Amino acid sequence: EKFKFSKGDGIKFSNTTFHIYEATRNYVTIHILKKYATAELMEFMHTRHDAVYIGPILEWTDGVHLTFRRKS
Amino acid sequence: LEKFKFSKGDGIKFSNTTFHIYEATRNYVTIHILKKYATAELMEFMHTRHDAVYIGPILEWTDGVHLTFRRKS
Amino acid sequence: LEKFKFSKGDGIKFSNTTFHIYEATRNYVTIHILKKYATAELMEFMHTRHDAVYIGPILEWTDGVHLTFRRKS
Amino acid sequence: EKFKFSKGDGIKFSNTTFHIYEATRNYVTIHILKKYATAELMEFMHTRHDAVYIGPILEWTDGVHLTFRRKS
Numbered sequence: 342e343k344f345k346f347s348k349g350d351g352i353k354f355s356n357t358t359f360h361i362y363e364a365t366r367n368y369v370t371i372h373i374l375k376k377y378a379t380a381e382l383m384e385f386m387h388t389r390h391d392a393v394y395i396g397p398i399l400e401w402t403d404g405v406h407l408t409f410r411r412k413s
Numbered sequence: 414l415e416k417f418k419f420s421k422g423d424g425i426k427f428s429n430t431t432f433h434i435y436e437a438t439r440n441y442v443t444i445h446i447l448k449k450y451a452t453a454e455l456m457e458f459m460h461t462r463h464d465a466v467y468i469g470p471i472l473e474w475t476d477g478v479h480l481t482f483r484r485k486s
Numbered sequence: 487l488e489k490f491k492f493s494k495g496d497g498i499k500f501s502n503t504t505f506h507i508y509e510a511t512r513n514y515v516t517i518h519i520l521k522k523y524a525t526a527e528l529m530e531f532m533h534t535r536h537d538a539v540y541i542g543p544i545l546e547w548t549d550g551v552h553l554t555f556r557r558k559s
Numbered sequence: 560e561k562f563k564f565s566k567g568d569g570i571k572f573s574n575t576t577f578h579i580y581e582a583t584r585n586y587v588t589i590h591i592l593k594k595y596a597t598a599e600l601m602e603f604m605h606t607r608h609d610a611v612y613i614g615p616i617l618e619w620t621d622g623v624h625l626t627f628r629r630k631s
Contacts, residue, residue, distance in 0.1 A: 362452060362453070363452050363453040363454050364453060365453050365454060365456070365457035366457065366461075367456070367457055367460055367461070368452075368453035368454075368456040368457050368460070369453055370452040370453040375545065376545070378543050378545060378554070379508060379509050379516040379545070379552055379554055380508070380509040380510060380511050380514035380515050380516040380554055381509050381511060381514075383511070383513070383514040383541070383554060383556070384511035384512065384513055384514050387513055387514070388512075388513075393541070393556070394541050394542065394543070394554075395456070395466070395467050396467065396469060396471075396542060396543060397451050397467070397469060397471045397480070398542075398543045399448065399449070399451060399452070406452055407543070408451070408452055408453055408456060408467075410456070410466070435597060435598070436597050436598040436599050437598060438598050438599060438601070438602035439602065439606075440601070440602055440605055440606075441598035441599075441601040441602050441605070442598050443597040443598040468601070468611070468612050469612065469614060469616075470596050470612070470614060470616045470625070472593065472594070472596060472597070479597055481596070481597055481598055481601060481612075483601070483611070521617065522617070524615050524617060524626070525580060525581050525586075525588040525617070525624055525626055526580070526581040526582060526583050526586035526587055526588040526626055527581050527583060527586075529583070529585070529586040529613070529626060529628070530583035530584065530585055530586050533585055533586070534584075534585070539613070539628070540613050540614065540615070540626075542614060542615060544614075544615045553615070
């Protein structure tokens with residue numbers, strides 16, 4: 342229920358939006374501006390989505406990919 | 414069968430690519446793959462098919478990256 | 487007392503330096519510190535004094551790095 | 560007993576030697592050539608020293624720092 346995403350979705354966080362690159366039963370990769378890869382995002386992902394950061398962090402032209410694991 | 418089982422040199426088909434086994438031990442494995450594939454779909458494949466979870470580090474090479482995983486069960 | 491407790495903006499003395507709190511939530515904290523200190527002595531300090539363990543990522547800034555930690559207990 | 564190191568020690572691994580930069584009750588930072596930051600080293604640290612990799616990985620002129628946590 343909490344760890345549920347669909348590829349292509351946009352999610353509001355803080356004063357930005359991150360996008361779902363890939364989502365599976367146990368993993369999710371988001372696209373977000375790198376400066377947001379800090380505690381507030383981690384708390385949001387953990388508390389709202391049962392998701393915890395595992396990496397790696399991959400650089401793209403307008404943001405980074407961050408991969409998270411389901412922690413139910 | 415033990416799912417966390419790999420052989421150095423093997424190629425494994427994943428998505429539209431093939432990754433290769435660099436090193437494999439009882440509890441760890443390092444694969445070689447294009448960096449763009451170091452995302453959720455690969456993690457799911459490794460977790461579900463091989464009881465393997467990502468620990469890093471991520472090492473750059475001329476034709477891909479090394480990624481190291483640990484056995485989870 | 488709850489050991490995993492921090493206030494944005496605070497400086498904390500560690501070794502021969504001072505690190506600063508960038509963000510702090512119930513379960514996560516991001517500190518700003520010189521990169522050379524992202525090693526075992528800092529990890530021990532954070533673990534033992536603050537119930538905090540390193541998760542990353544490590545972000546580069548002009549005068550140091552951001553490091554993110556998770557609450558362990 | 561297994562997770563026990565002293566700052567400055569040199570440890571033989573494979574065809575190289577790594578050095579202990581720092582060691583505490585629960586953490587150790589080693590200095591090693593980057594190409595060895597792969598499964599064989601992880602198995603050695605895990606099995607011989609009850610140590611598991613947490614990072615970060617820091618670049619120096621002749622190798623990298625890698626930080627590990629005690630996993631007893």
